[PDB]
Amino acid sequence: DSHKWEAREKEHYCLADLASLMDKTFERKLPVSSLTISRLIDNISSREEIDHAEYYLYKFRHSPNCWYLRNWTIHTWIRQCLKYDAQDKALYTLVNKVQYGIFPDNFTFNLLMDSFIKKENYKDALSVVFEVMMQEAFEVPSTQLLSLYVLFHCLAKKTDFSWEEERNFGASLLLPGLKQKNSVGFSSQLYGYALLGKVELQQGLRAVYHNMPLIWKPGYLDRALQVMEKVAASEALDVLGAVLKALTKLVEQLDIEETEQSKLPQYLERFKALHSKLQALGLTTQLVKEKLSTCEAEDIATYEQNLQQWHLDLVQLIQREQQQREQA
Amino acid sequence: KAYRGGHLTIRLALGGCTNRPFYRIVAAHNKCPRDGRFVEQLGSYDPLPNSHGEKLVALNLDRIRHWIGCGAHLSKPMEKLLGLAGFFPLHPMMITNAERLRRKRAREVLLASQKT
Amino acid sequence: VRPRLIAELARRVRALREQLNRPRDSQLYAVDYETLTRPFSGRRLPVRAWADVRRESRLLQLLGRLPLFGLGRLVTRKSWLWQHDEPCYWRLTRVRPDYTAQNLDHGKAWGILTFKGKTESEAREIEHVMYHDWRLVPKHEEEAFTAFTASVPYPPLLRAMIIAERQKNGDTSTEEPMLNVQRIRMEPWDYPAKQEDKGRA
Amino acid sequence: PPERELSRLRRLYQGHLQEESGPPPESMP
């Protein structure tokens, strides 16, 4: 997956020429070109130049051209991390994420993600899922591999998982639970809904839509109770979830709408009733291993179209750079 | 005098002596003082009950119609008085001030029931 | 006639310091979250916004977590969700973010409005970007989030006057003269105006 | 007013509230 882009549209391979012109402009407070950060990025060949690029990405984010951090520039940088390590500094840049502001919502997430599994990279690979969950993604077939890893770590970590990591499972469970293809997507949706509707009566609602892209509607357990009716018209932690709620600050809710602690006999029966029909109508980690084989038809044909887009882009970009210097 | 962004207002303006007020409705600016100069002088309002008990008001409505059509703002004590006049709709502050004393008397009637 | 050289020259010097070292958005828009004051102004905040400013985040510290700064995303004020059950939100067209702010925020953005199920083109500037009442509508269930389906008499002093006026005009014509409130529009007070019409202080 | 509106204003102004009746009576002597 590497030997395609490596015709990097050959340029200068220098750095002592470049790195002065990129902070003379900051000391004078000039706006900087959007291409010179990338030309710094496509000349890294040492681990100290990785940290040089990190300082300069930090200084490029705090700039008058705080926009124009283009996706192929990030793609060159993540190809630079794939060249050297792709073990810590890419993770640090994805986890800071505002000081640097990368955001590569592409197949670039999957290219960095699957290579973690090649060294199996558990604890360092878990965070990339946890930050792309906060992002909006998954208009791509990446839902299979994200769910693959997150159920690998479901069967690896087994606790209360934290105050908030129990919430940091659920959204990456739920938005890849848009799978109409199998009932395993509707199962991931259920396991998401269980442990995010579980924090609603534990701590409060605001923590769920604190930063992760959710919705402030307090009814989420019923949204699992209705997609299970969708299943029965077309899991076993919700059983402990609905009864664990039933066992022994700014209020947002209204005085006519009832608080959902008094409805736990209404949460027992509506859920314990329909599973008796799910019996009559109609493991997890092996299912996504079935899905890794059945799916992943490998759309690099769109990736190559983007490479063509960037070979269209940078040429007409540097044409105006040549004319801006002849205009003097 | 150049007023930095001044507009018209129809206000009261005092001209009574001490302990005997006498208002005067006047079309003036927003920033010229209370007893100061103006643009047009209108029919005044005497707030004291006269002999055999009347409080006298004057309204030159043919020119009050002219000024707020020309773009005059109005004071809330003036809008209460036009609401009492019926040239305006009655003021909601006047309505709820009536209702506040009516609910105070709704309390007072229960108070007079409890002390017999 | 005496021409005022220093009194005219000083307006130029005050203009090139209202324009050059005027302080940017981070250095007059932050809030001490403990003492409820502000940097560079020091005047405390209203007590109708203490819980909402302690507890809920602002617009562009939330919306700096998206690629190309959330170029087509939907967002909605916090008390908009409390007062308006109908859809009222912002589509985005452009963000001009602050850069000097660590944990980058406090930009100026402008885009398309929707109010209570009614939207309109000609993307104007958005109000209350520094305010702590913001909540992001995510790209999941945005299609479920967007969902939506006379004559009053005159004052009685005019009622007596204009009847006598028509009786002078020639026809009594006891059809009741009515002023139209259908031509008068009834926007509420939470309705936002153009951010340009206010200036920064 | 309907109580789905009265509850919203109560939710706005929870901690600072004065209990109240509805309409005043018809006549005051």
XYZ file of C-alpha atoms in Angstrom:
674
model
C 0.000 0.000 0.000
C 3.111 2.147 -0.076
C 4.660 1.792 -3.545
C 2.085 3.956 -5.348
C 2.452 7.460 -3.882
C 6.264 7.249 -3.583
C 6.635 9.173 -6.833
C 6.285 12.240 -4.623
C 6.569 14.862 -7.437
C 10.309 15.391 -6.895
C 11.318 18.717 -5.391
C 14.165 20.165 -3.337
C 15.506 17.788 -0.693
C 16.839 20.535 1.576
C 15.985 21.786 5.062
C 18.494 24.462 6.129
C 17.189 26.443 3.175
C 13.588 25.977 4.317
C 13.408 26.149 8.102
C 14.628 29.749 8.324
C 12.059 31.069 5.834
C 9.288 29.435 7.874
C 9.966 31.282 11.128
C 11.266 34.531 9.665
C 7.692 34.826 8.433
C 6.382 34.041 11.934
C 8.690 36.585 13.608
C 7.606 39.197 11.054
C 4.048 37.761 11.374
C 3.694 37.167 7.716
C 1.158 34.688 6.421
C 2.950 31.654 5.081
C 2.418 29.563 1.985
C 0.442 26.372 2.365
C 2.899 24.428 0.229
C 6.097 25.076 2.174
C 4.891 23.149 5.213
C 4.368 20.198 2.865
C 7.787 20.684 1.286
C 9.262 20.581 4.780
C 7.219 17.424 5.368
C 8.372 15.599 2.209
C 12.072 15.973 3.177
C 12.097 14.319 6.629
C 14.621 11.491 6.845
C 15.586 11.387 10.538
C 13.933 11.023 13.920
C 14.940 14.511 14.999
C 13.353 15.837 11.805
C 10.169 14.122 13.002
C 10.216 16.417 16.052
C 11.203 19.383 13.858
C 8.062 18.684 11.826
C 6.071 18.465 15.053
C 7.201 21.915 16.290
C 6.519 23.330 12.839
C 3.071 21.739 12.671
C 2.326 23.360 16.024
C 3.505 26.699 14.659
C 1.592 26.198 11.420
C -1.665 25.662 13.287
C -1.207 28.998 15.144
C -0.934 30.981 11.935
C -3.007 33.359 9.762
C -3.324 30.464 7.323
C -4.963 28.359 10.004
C -6.973 26.974 7.117
C -5.279 25.343 4.040
C -3.935 22.407 6.061
C -4.695 20.196 3.091
C -5.328 16.479 3.260
C -2.477 15.416 0.986
C -0.032 17.337 3.193
C -1.225 15.280 6.158
C -1.069 12.247 3.905
C 2.576 12.956 3.134
C 3.212 13.288 6.874
C 1.477 10.036 7.746
C 3.433 8.451 4.913
C 6.517 9.907 6.609
C 5.486 8.268 9.876
C 4.822 5.049 7.953
C 8.337 5.431 6.586
C 10.045 5.899 9.926
C 8.002 4.442 12.774
C 4.232 5.037 12.947
C 4.396 4.164 16.657
C 4.347 7.285 18.846
C 4.566 10.668 17.103
C 1.633 10.066 14.775
C -0.326 8.938 17.869
C 0.730 12.085 19.752
C -0.414 14.226 16.824
C -3.752 12.390 16.634
C -4.254 12.729 20.387
C -3.380 16.421 20.671
C -5.392 17.023 17.491
C -6.124 20.727 18.035
C -2.569 22.009 18.590
C -1.805 20.330 15.254
C -5.167 19.908 13.569
C -4.554 17.020 11.210
C -7.982 15.310 10.839
C -7.382 12.782 8.039
C -10.931 11.464 7.446
C -9.895 9.173 4.572
C -8.689 5.633 4.036
C -5.641 7.124 5.808
C -7.273 6.174 9.090
C -7.542 2.541 7.936
C -3.998 2.527 6.540
C -2.624 3.618 9.898
C -5.104 1.404 11.794
C -4.569 -2.001 10.122
C -0.765 -1.700 10.310
C -1.131 -1.600 14.089
C -2.582 -5.133 13.892
C 0.557 -6.261 12.039
C 2.478 -5.755 15.304
C -0.903 -6.244 17.107
C -0.194 -2.905 18.890
C -2.972 -3.051 21.479
C -2.607 -0.144 23.901
C -1.251 2.348 21.371
C -3.765 1.302 18.709
C -6.751 1.693 21.041
C -6.463 5.489 21.145
C -6.849 5.992 17.381
C -10.302 4.398 17.568
C -11.033 6.602 20.588
C -10.192 9.789 18.657
C -11.839 8.842 15.329
C -14.945 8.056 17.392
C -15.083 11.745 18.375
C -14.783 12.570 14.673
C -17.440 11.956 12.063
C -16.322 9.137 9.762
C -17.751 5.840 8.454
C -19.210 6.931 5.161
C -16.569 4.333 4.203
C -16.452 0.525 4.725
C -14.158 1.025 7.779
C -16.995 0.005 10.141
C -15.932 -3.645 9.906
C -12.326 -3.127 10.980
C -13.133 -0.567 13.692
C -15.668 -2.971 15.188
C -13.168 -5.837 14.741
C -10.612 -4.096 16.934
C -13.117 -2.750 19.439
C -14.499 -6.228 20.083
C -10.926 -7.523 20.306
C -10.573 -5.062 23.195
C -14.059 -5.881 24.451
C -12.743 -9.401 24.964
C -9.468 -7.950 26.331
C -10.539 -5.298 28.854
C -13.387 -6.259 31.187
C -14.098 -3.766 34.000
C -16.383 -0.799 34.615
C -13.821 0.421 32.005
C -13.909 3.875 33.725
C -16.226 6.691 34.614
C -16.030 7.713 30.953
C -14.304 4.984 28.871
C -17.585 3.108 29.182
C -18.881 6.072 27.196
C -15.797 5.939 24.950
C -16.790 2.472 23.816
C -20.377 3.226 22.958
C -20.232 5.813 20.199
C -17.651 3.853 18.193
C -20.025 0.954 18.749
C -23.069 2.909 17.619
C -22.076 4.882 14.542
C -20.569 1.731 12.985
C -23.899 0.194 14.053
C -25.414 1.593 10.852
C -24.838 -1.819 9.233
C -27.972 -2.852 7.381
C -25.899 -5.734 5.998
C -26.102 -7.981 9.061
C -27.773 -8.240 12.452
C -24.279 -7.994 13.952
C -24.445 -4.246 13.272
C -27.791 -4.099 15.076
C -26.049 -6.042 17.880
C -23.218 -3.502 18.137
C -25.925 -0.822 18.255
C -27.530 -2.676 21.172
C -24.282 -3.067 23.117
C -23.591 0.617 22.521
C -27.073 1.638 23.678
C -26.779 -0.540 26.782
C -23.592 0.966 28.131
C -24.471 4.526 27.121
C -27.990 4.334 28.562
C -26.292 2.811 31.574
C -24.371 6.022 32.292
C -27.545 8.125 31.984
C -28.848 7.038 35.367
C -25.396 6.438 36.805
C -23.914 9.916 36.401
C -25.927 12.110 34.044
C -26.837 12.973 30.487
C -24.390 15.820 29.784
C -21.319 13.588 29.854
C -22.554 11.682 26.787
C -22.802 14.798 24.600
C -19.854 16.462 26.326
C -17.572 16.006 23.356
C -18.492 12.824 21.511
C -20.971 13.455 18.670
C -24.213 12.310 20.285
C -27.667 13.780 20.848
C -29.037 15.339 24.083
C -32.257 13.289 23.987
C -32.477 11.431 27.327
C -34.265 8.454 25.765
C -31.696 5.995 24.491
C -32.729 2.710 26.136
C -36.005 2.836 24.223
C -34.018 3.262 21.017
C -32.539 -0.183 21.696
C -35.978 -1.458 22.707
C -37.362 -0.378 19.306
C -34.521 -1.643 17.107
C -35.030 -4.970 18.824
C -38.633 -4.789 17.582
C -37.079 -4.011 14.188
C -35.047 -7.221 14.593
C -38.120 -9.257 15.599
C -39.939 -7.844 12.566
C -36.936 -8.807 10.416
C -26.934 -8.717 23.475
C -26.811 -10.349 26.896
C -25.445 -7.343 28.808
C -28.675 -5.398 28.343
C -30.220 -8.115 30.552
C -27.948 -7.077 33.400
C -28.186 -3.473 32.247
C -31.938 -3.029 32.690
C -31.935 -4.746 36.094
C -28.715 -3.014 37.271
C -30.563 0.218 36.674
C -33.427 -1.195 38.784
C -31.246 -2.152 41.758
C -30.736 0.029 44.813
C -26.609 19.911 39.839
C -28.539 21.323 36.868
C -31.728 19.372 36.219
C -32.738 19.730 32.586
C -35.928 17.632 32.518
C -39.484 18.839 32.834
C -42.001 18.382 35.643
C -44.626 16.791 33.366
C -42.239 14.348 31.708
C -41.461 11.640 34.254
C -37.886 10.975 35.335
C -36.745 7.618 34.001
C -35.740 6.131 37.349
C -39.404 5.468 38.221
C -39.894 3.405 35.029
C -37.715 0.438 35.857
C -40.664 -1.987 36.023
C -41.417 -0.432 32.623
C -37.826 -1.206 31.603
C -38.005 -4.784 32.888
C -41.086 -6.103 31.115
C -40.774 -4.448 27.673
C -37.309 -5.990 27.314
C -37.915 -9.353 29.005
C -41.017 -9.892 26.874
C -39.658 -9.635 23.326
C -36.638 -11.925 23.752
C -39.212 -14.695 24.236
C -40.249 -13.877 20.641
C -36.643 -13.478 19.443
C -36.246 -17.118 20.452
C -39.123 -18.152 18.148
C -37.995 -15.878 15.288
C -34.221 -15.438 15.204
C -19.401 -15.793 18.529
C -19.158 -12.019 18.040
C -15.408 -11.925 17.423
C -15.734 -14.833 15.004
C -18.489 -12.952 13.149
C -16.195 -10.040 12.325
C -13.587 -12.549 11.203
C -16.243 -13.863 8.817
C -16.757 -10.244 7.787
C -13.062 -9.488 7.255
C -13.077 -12.273 4.655
C -16.482 -11.607 3.096
C -15.894 -7.848 2.889
C -12.884 -5.571 2.219
C -12.922 -5.404 -1.545
C -10.177 -2.734 -1.104
C -11.187 0.547 -2.696
C -7.764 1.902 -3.696
C -9.387 2.887 -6.993
C -10.776 5.960 -5.223
C -7.445 6.507 -3.438
C -5.728 6.605 -6.839
C -8.374 9.064 -8.020
C -7.392 11.255 -5.060
C -3.726 10.855 -6.029
C -4.727 12.127 -9.470
C -6.592 14.966 -7.746
C -3.427 15.908 -5.848
C -1.268 15.712 -8.980
C -3.817 18.084 -10.448
C -3.677 20.220 -7.300
C -0.031 20.871 -6.513
C 0.931 21.625 -10.141
C -1.535 24.498 -10.568
C -0.641 25.544 -7.008
C 3.073 25.986 -7.737
C 2.320 27.610 -11.108
C 1.009 30.656 -9.238
C 4.068 30.445 -6.985
C 6.303 30.803 -10.027
C 4.218 33.694 -11.355
C 4.167 35.477 -7.972
C 7.974 35.660 -8.135
C 8.079 36.881 -11.730
C 5.475 39.543 -10.914
C 8.063 41.354 -8.761
C -26.100 71.050 18.996
C -24.839 67.850 17.426
C -26.166 64.913 19.389
C -24.178 61.753 18.648
C -27.044 59.597 17.431
C -30.076 61.173 19.052
C -33.686 60.463 18.208
C -37.080 61.910 19.024
C -39.109 61.084 22.124
C -42.473 62.261 23.413
C -41.971 62.630 27.147
C -43.342 64.274 30.199
C -41.511 67.332 31.488
C -41.964 68.803 34.944
C -42.944 72.380 35.671
C -44.668 72.229 39.035
C -43.473 73.654 42.303
C -42.241 71.585 45.245
C -44.829 69.069 46.524
C -47.144 70.130 43.652
C -46.093 68.396 40.438
C -47.297 69.469 37.019
C -46.260 67.411 34.018
C -46.196 68.645 30.433
C -46.071 66.331 27.427
C -43.386 67.532 25.035
C -41.867 66.289 21.777
C -38.119 66.696 22.221
C -34.892 64.783 21.760
C -33.724 61.727 23.619
C -30.727 63.446 25.203
C -31.817 67.025 25.906
C -32.637 67.300 29.621
C -35.983 67.045 31.391
C -36.786 70.731 31.864
C -34.889 71.664 28.685
C -35.569 72.701 25.101
C -37.585 70.718 22.593
C -39.001 70.513 19.088
C -42.710 71.062 19.732
C -44.752 71.760 22.836
C -47.959 69.790 23.315
C -50.937 69.731 25.641
C -49.834 69.288 29.216
C -50.950 66.865 31.937
C -51.875 68.069 35.420
C -51.597 65.146 37.890
C -53.356 66.674 40.800
C -57.055 66.234 41.529
C -58.766 69.603 41.185
C -61.820 71.023 42.877
C -64.543 68.315 42.844
C -61.955 65.677 41.973
C -60.633 65.453 38.405
C -57.091 64.956 37.094
C -56.753 66.952 33.908
C -54.922 65.745 30.795
C -54.516 67.342 27.375
C -53.748 65.646 24.057
C -53.324 67.486 20.762
C -53.914 64.253 18.862
C -53.742 65.862 15.398
C -50.046 66.518 16.100
C -49.367 63.468 18.265
C -50.375 61.549 15.125
C -47.866 63.669 13.191
C -44.886 63.088 15.442
C -44.941 59.317 15.992
C -45.570 59.046 12.296
C -42.450 61.144 11.830
C -40.616 58.635 14.006
C -40.973 59.586 17.660
C -40.376 57.091 20.436
C -42.544 57.187 23.549
C -41.981 56.898 27.285
C -43.632 54.096 29.237
C -45.374 56.554 31.633
C -46.671 58.263 28.508
C -47.828 54.951 27.036
C -49.723 54.170 30.230
C -51.468 57.520 29.939
C -52.409 57.015 26.298
C -53.629 53.549 27.269
C -55.865 55.139 29.867
C -56.933 57.585 27.170
C -57.779 54.927 24.615
C -55.736 56.539 21.855
C -53.419 53.601 22.420
C -54.072 50.047 23.491
C -53.976 49.767 27.260
C -50.541 49.021 28.604
C -49.726 45.472 29.757
C -47.717 46.928 32.624
C -50.879 48.829 33.598
C -52.885 45.606 33.328
C -50.516 43.562 35.492
C -50.205 46.438 37.955
C -53.981 46.274 38.282
C -53.766 42.500 38.707
C -51.048 42.769 41.354
C -53.225 44.924 43.600
C -56.214 42.721 42.790
C -54.272 39.661 43.953
C -53.104 41.606 47.010
C -56.769 42.241 47.801
C -57.479 38.578 47.027
C -55.047 37.931 49.878
C -56.610 40.669 52.065
C -60.094 39.121 51.804
C -58.780 35.793 53.154
C -56.992 37.818 55.860
C -60.284 39.462 56.827
C -61.945 36.038 56.857
C -59.330 34.618 59.249
C -59.704 37.366 61.871
C -63.446 37.059 62.626
C -9.371 80.610 10.977
C -7.138 78.266 12.995
C -6.548 74.766 11.553
C -6.113 72.115 14.241
C -2.952 70.262 13.269
C -2.466 68.214 16.435
C -6.200 67.643 16.923
C -6.426 66.243 13.419
C -3.123 64.337 13.580
C -4.094 62.602 16.822
C -7.172 61.005 15.227
C -4.815 59.347 12.743
C -2.579 58.017 15.518
C -5.604 56.740 17.442
C -6.876 55.067 14.250
C -3.577 53.268 13.592
C -3.792 51.915 17.163
C -7.447 50.985 16.996
C -6.402 49.039 13.891
C -2.918 47.688 14.673
C -2.661 46.758 18.358
C -6.345 46.231 18.926
C -6.594 43.031 20.994
C -7.766 39.828 19.349
C -10.607 37.549 20.404
C -8.785 35.333 22.940
C -7.451 38.318 24.896
C -10.829 39.890 25.549
C -13.267 36.969 25.273
C -11.979 34.446 27.806
C -13.549 33.982 31.239
C -12.088 33.026 34.587
C -14.281 29.982 35.204
C -13.697 30.207 38.966
C -14.193 33.933 39.643
C -16.565 34.705 36.704
C -14.541 37.713 35.530
C -12.926 38.379 32.186
C -9.383 39.137 31.067
C -8.682 42.724 29.936
C -12.112 43.980 31.068
C -12.565 42.602 34.566
C -16.329 43.129 34.677
C -18.210 40.122 36.057
C -20.921 38.191 34.245
C -24.701 38.099 34.796
C -26.108 35.582 37.248
C -28.653 34.395 34.696
C -25.617 32.885 32.979
C -23.439 31.221 35.590
C -24.531 27.590 35.384
C -24.697 27.742 31.585
C -21.251 29.315 31.390
C -19.665 26.924 33.890
C -21.230 23.826 32.392
C -21.626 24.176 28.623
C -18.940 24.888 26.005
C -18.628 27.609 23.390
C -18.950 27.428 19.610
C -15.446 27.498 18.174
C -13.732 25.537 20.894
C -16.171 22.776 19.995
C -16.047 23.379 16.228
C -12.259 23.317 15.929
C -12.348 19.519 16.201
C -13.542 18.910 12.619
C -11.710 18.776 9.258
C -11.783 22.094 7.394
C -13.339 23.508 10.593
C -16.736 21.902 10.036
C -17.440 23.294 6.592
C -20.969 21.922 6.282
C -21.980 20.986 9.797
C -25.047 21.837 11.848
C -24.958 23.447 15.292
C -27.594 24.872 17.635
C -27.557 27.055 20.758
C -28.257 25.456 24.115
C -31.263 27.573 25.069
C -32.487 27.137 21.504
C -33.037 23.498 22.453
C -34.796 24.627 25.612
C -37.111 27.249 24.091
C -37.597 25.812 20.603
C -38.737 22.255 20.038
C -38.881 23.152 16.346
C -35.636 22.967 14.299
C -33.512 26.112 14.543
C -29.858 25.771 13.565
C -26.868 26.993 11.574
C -25.380 25.704 8.363
C -21.820 26.855 7.913
C -20.111 28.479 4.939
C -16.869 29.903 6.333
C -14.859 30.067 9.570
C -12.208 32.738 10.149
C -10.565 31.289 13.244
C -8.317 32.916 15.769
C -4.793 31.586 15.651
C -3.235 33.110 18.767
C -5.543 31.165 21.077
C -4.024 28.089 22.644
C -6.747 25.433 22.411
C -7.900 27.248 19.281
C -11.282 28.926 19.486
C -12.999 32.326 19.342
C -13.116 32.628 15.562
C -15.676 34.452 13.480
C -17.932 32.321 11.320
C -20.823 32.993 9.009
C -23.447 30.856 7.374
C -27.062 29.998 6.732
C -29.786 30.242 9.386
C -32.821 28.097 10.136
C -35.379 29.378 12.660
C -38.227 27.103 13.968
C -38.359 25.137 10.706
C -37.819 28.110 8.386
C -34.481 28.741 6.685
C -33.201 31.335 4.224
C -30.307 31.857 1.778
C -27.812 34.766 1.546
C -25.514 33.484 4.292
C -25.245 36.192 6.922
C -22.943 36.481 9.905
C -23.786 34.432 12.962
C -24.444 35.810 16.428
C -23.093 34.884 19.870
C -20.008 33.007 18.686
C -18.233 33.719 21.983
C -21.240 32.494 23.972
C -21.105 29.389 26.141
C -24.435 28.039 24.870
C -23.563 25.721 22.008
C -24.329 22.119 21.139
C -23.315 20.166 18.048
C -25.918 18.345 15.976
C -23.963 15.310 14.704
C -24.094 13.887 11.188
C -25.911 10.887 12.630
C -29.682 11.533 12.837
C -29.376 14.938 11.162
C -32.155 13.720 8.854
C -34.303 13.068 11.936
C -33.285 16.381 13.490
C -34.488 18.320 10.447
C -38.214 17.560 10.663
C -41.094 20.028 10.462
C -44.687 20.223 9.227
C -55.749 38.452 11.287
C -57.545 41.806 11.625
C -57.805 43.549 15.014
C -59.963 46.668 15.594
C -58.707 50.204 16.078
C -58.199 51.926 19.431
C -61.574 53.164 20.701
C -60.589 56.817 20.424
C -59.916 56.271 16.741
C -63.139 54.269 16.441
C -65.174 57.291 17.454
C -63.058 59.742 15.436
C -62.968 58.018 12.045
C -66.698 57.158 12.132
C -67.382 60.872 12.552
C -64.826 61.485 9.805
C -66.681 59.258 7.334
C -69.975 60.835 8.404
C -68.382 64.111 7.344
C -67.089 62.445 4.174
C -70.653 61.765 3.086
C -71.417 58.095 3.634
C -71.942 56.807 7.174
C -71.024 53.303 5.895
C -71.066 51.318 9.155
C -68.557 48.707 7.869
C -66.096 48.507 10.743
C -62.748 50.161 9.866
C -60.034 47.652 10.738
C -56.244 47.915 10.747
C -54.320 44.923 9.445
C -51.852 43.020 11.619
C -51.364 40.360 8.920
C -48.900 42.786 7.327
C -47.003 43.035 10.619
C -44.409 40.353 11.327
C -43.982 38.818 14.755
C -40.409 37.637 15.281
C -39.525 36.620 18.870
C -36.678 38.016 20.945
C -34.401 35.001 20.657
C -34.239 35.737 16.906
C -30.655 36.678 16.021
C -29.554 39.722 14.058
C -26.543 40.477 11.865
C -23.239 40.269 13.748
C -21.808 43.108 11.646
C -24.434 45.552 12.958
C -22.774 45.264 16.341
C -19.114 46.098 16.617
C -16.531 44.459 18.828
C -15.566 46.432 21.924
C -50.812 28.977 29.356
C -50.378 25.258 28.657
C -48.253 23.391 31.151
C -45.767 22.194 28.531
C -44.907 25.878 28.265
C -45.183 26.628 31.990
C -42.802 23.753 32.785
C -40.253 25.101 30.282
C -40.190 28.478 32.009
C -39.966 26.656 35.348
C -36.981 24.735 33.963
C -35.432 28.057 32.911
C -35.956 29.651 36.320
C -35.802 26.678 38.728
C -33.929 28.086 41.737
C -35.555 31.525 41.651
C -39.320 31.026 41.625
C -42.371 32.536 43.247
C -45.432 30.330 43.664
C -48.568 31.855 42.236
C -52.286 31.514 41.636
C -54.031 31.857 38.299
C -56.608 34.507 37.485
C -57.564 37.155 40.012
C -61.194 37.200 41.187
C -63.833 39.214 39.349
C -64.533 42.146 41.676
C -62.775 43.899 44.552
C -64.726 45.886 47.192
